[PDB]
Amino acid sequence: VRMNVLADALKSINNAEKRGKRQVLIRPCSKVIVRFLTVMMKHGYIGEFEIIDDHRAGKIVVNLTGRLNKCGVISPRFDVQLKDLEKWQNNLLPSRQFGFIVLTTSAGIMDHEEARRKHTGGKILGFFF
């Protein structure tokens, strides 16, 4: 069956971006998907998206600015400490100049740079560059 709806969302975005499409339909939606999309959008990787409100579970239409090289999930959500963040971001990111690791944190869902700014660790949700 379907576990990790965030994995499905990120893989659908990845495949739509590879196909060159300007919009992708993501279903089901969830809070974690919305926060991940907001993290991706604050860095200009996707652009505005819309939540279609069914009465069962969300749908999302994400507009796709052709900037996303790759958005992926890390399963399982390994717990990550601050001292171990550099190793994760050296394994997952193409450069030290761009690309973000998303972590769920007691302070919210946010990228690794802002996690460093808040001096906090968490669980790795995924990455995008």
Binding site: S75, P76, R77, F78
Partner: protein
């Protein structure tokens, strides 16, 4: 595919332990039959008494009498 779960450490460790025995080098090193069958008994060198001198014919592409000794 392989299991990717936060609580699969036992399965991963046991699978690696079992599948290491399918490696020739590992099984030879860790099984003990090779050390029992090794004439030196794990030593780098060994002393012996020359029983006789023998000549071994080189394998088919080559032709020579390699001078060995039975010790």
């Amino acid at each position: 595919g392989k299991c990717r779960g936060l609580r699969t450490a036992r399965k991963l460790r046991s699978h690696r332990r079992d599948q290491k025995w399918h490696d020739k080098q590992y099984k030879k090193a860790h099984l003990g039959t090779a050390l029992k069958a090794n004439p030196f008994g794990g030593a780098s060198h060994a002393k012996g008494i020359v029983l006789e001198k023998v000549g071994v014919e080189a394998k088919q592409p080559n032709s020579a009498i390699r001078k060995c000794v039975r010790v």
